[PDB]
Design a protein around this nucleic acid. Structure first.
Ligand SMILES: [K+]
Ligand SMILES: [K+]
Ligand SMILES: [K+]
Ligand SMILES: [K+]
Ligand SMILES: [K+]
Ligand SMILES: [K+]
Ligand SMILES: [Mg+2]
Ligand SMILES: [Mg+2]
Ligand SMILES: [Mg+2]
Ligand SMILES: [Mg+2]
Ligand SMILES: [Mg+2]
Ligand SMILES: [Mg+2]
Ligand SMILES: [Mg+2]
Ligand SMILES: [Mg+2]
Ligand SMILES: [Mg+2]
Ligand SMILES: [Mg+2]
Ligand SMILES: [Mg+2]
Ligand SMILES: [Mg+2]
Ligand SMILES: [Mg+2]
Ligand SMILES: [Mg+2]
Ligand SMILES: [Mg+2]
Lengths: 109, 115, 108, 51, 211
RNA sequence: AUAGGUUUGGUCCUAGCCUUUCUAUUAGCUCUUAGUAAGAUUACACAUGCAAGCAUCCCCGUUCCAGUGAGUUCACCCUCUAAAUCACCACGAUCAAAAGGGACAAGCAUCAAGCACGCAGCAAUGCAGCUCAAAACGCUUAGCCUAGCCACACCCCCACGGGAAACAGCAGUGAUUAACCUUUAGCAAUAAACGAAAGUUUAACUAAGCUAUACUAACCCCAGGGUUGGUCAAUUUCGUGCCAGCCACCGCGGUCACAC
């Protein structure tokens, strides 16, 4: 009722930024193999409107469905950047981190 | 499937075997085949008397009312069946046929008396 | 193979079944072109009665005539079924006895 | 013919009244399913539980 | 999808050719009175109309003999006169004659309807204009023809429910604690059974296609 | 699979082929009754008769039902919203097109690249991008996910137009194939069309006809078919003599052949 786009909220990795104000994002879902009964990753490509062109290749982003498609393949918009590439902020503690190590200690604050 | 015009109607779909009929009360598109696709089965009707000498009719009254309130029509045999159940007034043709049968049997009795 | 490799390859893909001399049909009608005899491969020795027939599909094929004594001539119509003649290499069709021109074997 | 005509008129009048009442019941049930007081109470309870 | 453009062209061409080769009323609604068949289609008229087709007049057969095509005059129908004792008629307001007719005896008309003495509020198109059922009210008779005293139209205000439905209603009331002894009743004041011969909406009616 | 036969002088292992089970079509031989179900090989060509009327003229219907499987991810879910039914005063429900998003058959990668397949801007125009080994692009195969659904309605995808004169409606016919139902009756029931209605029409349908294709039950007298070396239940005499012939696999037949 709010949108004609099937996928409403999706999380992906940005794999392309060569289009103006548009980010090419790779979204992985878990699909059960009918024979092996094991979950494997299935990939799909989405084009997300990035008005400010703040997306970099490799960062994890959240995409929200547009009310209607603004182009043939652009049906989504960048709601936020969940993880900036190489600039991750730990949501649990709110401190910068490099991989599994704290760049700034939680105790310091 | 898209039909040109048409409407929903509650009717009798014929099943069973040769010389043994049975009816399923179904709400279906009027253009669909008699025993084909239907929207919902609203009951059943066995026209052959059973071991107790009864003709068994099952009516889903709630769903019948729902589909009538959704704009569904009714086939004439269903109007007669619902009149027999007391759900509707008796259809005029049942009354007229009863009167015709009364007059015919009166004529037969008068023939017997004349003889 | 690992589970990842099995998922990649998917279910086994069985090749389609090979069609035989009858091309997947129970029987075939045919016209006799010539009758002759062929010799078995040798653990055995005999003169097996055979005939070349043009089938309804247009292909020419060698067929075996079972039973003792046949009266098949050229231009006659026969019905041929499957079943290899184990002794004759390349002969994979058999003439049906008691159908069209090919009659039943005479008693004794 | 005349008696049958009158009978049909009366029967159709009664059937139309019954049909309008059934339509009203269907619409009332739809309205009570969407904006009914019980449905609204359930929605508010679910929102409070989520919060 | 491989486009189907020939279908587009065919539909557009057929629409244009149907809009430009429209059959006119003089062609569609002509009748051969000897065989009582339509020359346009060859289909014969129903038996019950035959006599009327040979005795009565079409509406514009009357209107074409009048100044201004009889605007403001009253026209009634033979079937209405036979069926109903109360006055039924049309007061003409607009007429569109079919100029292609030799006698200007085909076309369309609009007016105010009075059925069984009840006049309508607006003017709408007249149906069955091509029927052989029409009569013209003389001017010196209109006062006598239109006279009508509205009789008390008091009909049943409500009717009993069917037996099973009444029993179900009463059972539901008793289950819900209600102990009222009032009979369930179906209101039929909002159901006005209109006579089957009342004029329908000619604006919604279709037209015979040219063939 | 509770498995079995078959490689070797012999054992074990590996591996194929075949046997035993259950269906459908056809063929040989045989075949008694009753009920029920099912029923051209061919999208090849069709003689003939019917398969759509109703109704006071307008309209409505003939866009349905019925048929076929040629082609083939138009069928399913969500959003939006026409037409249609009922409210018909609409508020809206039911149903369901077009449009937008998602999902959706099989084989071949010896089909590996497609060649404009994208984006941004009110537009002007700018950027050079988009799909693809997680299978794009391509060739081939097939009606499907069966309360049913999809596609087609002689052919040129379509049908203004052309070829040309249409049974893939029922009955029926020619040719063709291993494949072979009556040129029956009635609208009495249900369904559909029309009518205000009594009602009318319908090769849908109902009731019949033909056919061991199947199931069920019988039968007063009435049984046939296949097999009998092992796998695998079951051969006595003769005839023949590596000939005639036989076998699903292994194999038999050279004067004592349980294998012809
Ligand atoms: K030998
Ligand atoms: K009509
Ligand atoms: K097909
Ligand atoms: K086509
Ligand atoms: K009938
Ligand atoms: K011997
Ligand atoms: Mg083995
Ligand atoms: Mg050995
Ligand atoms: Mg047989
Ligand atoms: Mg509408
Ligand atoms: Mg659609
Ligand atoms: Mg490869
Ligand atoms: Mg090659
Ligand atoms: Mg095909
Ligand atoms: Mg044809
Ligand atoms: Mg075509
Ligand atoms: Mg036919
Ligand atoms: Mg057959
Ligand atoms: Mg007939
Ligand atoms: Mg039958
Ligand atoms: Mg023997």
């Amino acid at each position: 009722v709010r949108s004609s786009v099937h996928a409403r909220w999706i999380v992906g990795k940005v794999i392309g930024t060569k289009m103006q104000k548009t980010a090419k994002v790779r979204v992985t879902r878990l699909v059960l193999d009918p024979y092996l009964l094991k979950y494997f990753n299935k990939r799909k490509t989405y084009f997300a409107h990035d008005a400010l062109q703040q997306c970099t290749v490799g960062d994890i982003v959240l995409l929200r469905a547009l009310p209607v498609p603004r182009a043939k393949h652009v049906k989504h918009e960048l709601a936020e950047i969940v993880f900036k590439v190489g600039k991750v902020i730990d949501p649990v503690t709110g401190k910068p981190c490099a991989g599994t190590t704290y760049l700034e200690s939680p105790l310091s604050s | 499937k898209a039909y040109r015009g048409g409407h929903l109607t509650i009717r009798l779909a014929l099943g069973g075997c040769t010389n043994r009929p049975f009816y399923r009360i179904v709400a279906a598109h009027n253009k669909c085949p008699r025993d084909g696709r239907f929207v919902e089965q609203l009951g059943s009707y066995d026209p052959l008397p059973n071991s107790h000498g009864e003709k068994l009719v099952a009516l889903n009254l709630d769903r019948i009312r729902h589909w009538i309130g959704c704009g569904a029509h009714l086939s004439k045999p269903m109007e007669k069946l619902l009149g027999l159940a007391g759900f509707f007034p008796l259809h005029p043709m049942m009354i007229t046929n009863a009167e015709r049968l009364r007059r015919k049997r009166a004529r037969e009795v008068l023939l017997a008396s004349q003889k | 193979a690992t589970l990842n490799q099995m998922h990649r390859l998917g279910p086994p893909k069985r090749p389609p079944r090979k069609l035989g001399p009858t091309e997947g049909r129970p029987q075939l009608k045919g016209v006799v072109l010539c009758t002759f005899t062929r010799k078995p491969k040798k653990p055995n020795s005999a003169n097996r009665k055979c005939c070349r027939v043009r089938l309804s599909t247009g292909r020419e094929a060698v067929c075996f005539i079972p039973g003792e004594g046949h009266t098949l001539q050229e231009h006659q119509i026969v019905l041929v079924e499957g079943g290899r003649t184990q002794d004759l290499p390349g002969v994979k069709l058999t003439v049906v006895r008691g159908k069209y021109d090919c009659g039943h074997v005479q008693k004794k | 013919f005349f008696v049958l005509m009158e009978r049909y008129q009366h029967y159709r009048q009664t059937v139309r009244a019954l049909r309008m009442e059934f339509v009203s019941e269907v619409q009332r049930k739809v309205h009570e399913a969407r904006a009914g007081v019980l449905a609204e109470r359930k929605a508010l309870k679910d929102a409070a539980e989520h919060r | 999808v491989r486009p189907r453009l020939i279908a587009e062209l065919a539909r557009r061409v057929r629409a244009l050719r149907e809009q430009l080769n429209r059959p006119r009323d003089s062609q569609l609604y002509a009748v051969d009175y000897e065989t009582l068949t339509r020359p346009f289609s060859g289909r014969r008229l129903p038996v019950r109309a035959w006599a009327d087709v040979r005795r009565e007049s079409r509406l514009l057969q009357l209107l074409g003999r009048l100044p201004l095509f009889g605007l403001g005059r009253l026209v009634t129908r033979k079937s209405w006169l036979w069926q109903h004792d109360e006055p039924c008629y049309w007061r003409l307001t607009r007429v569109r004659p079919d100029y292609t007719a030799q006698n200007l005896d085909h076309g369309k008309a609009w007016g105010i309807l009075t059925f069984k003495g009840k006049t309508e509020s607006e003017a709408r198109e007249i149906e069955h204009v091509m029927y052989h059922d029409w009569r013209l009210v003389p001017k010196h008779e209109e006062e006598a023809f239109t006279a009508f005293t509205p009789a008390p139209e008091d009909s049943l205000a409500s009717v009993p429910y069917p037996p099973l439905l009444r029993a179900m209603i009463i059972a539901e009331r008793q289950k819900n604690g209600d102990t009222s002894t009032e009979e369930p009743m179906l209101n039929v004041q909002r159901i006005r059974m209109e006579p089957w011969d009342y004029p329908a909406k000619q604006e919604d009616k279709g037209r015979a296609k040219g063939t």
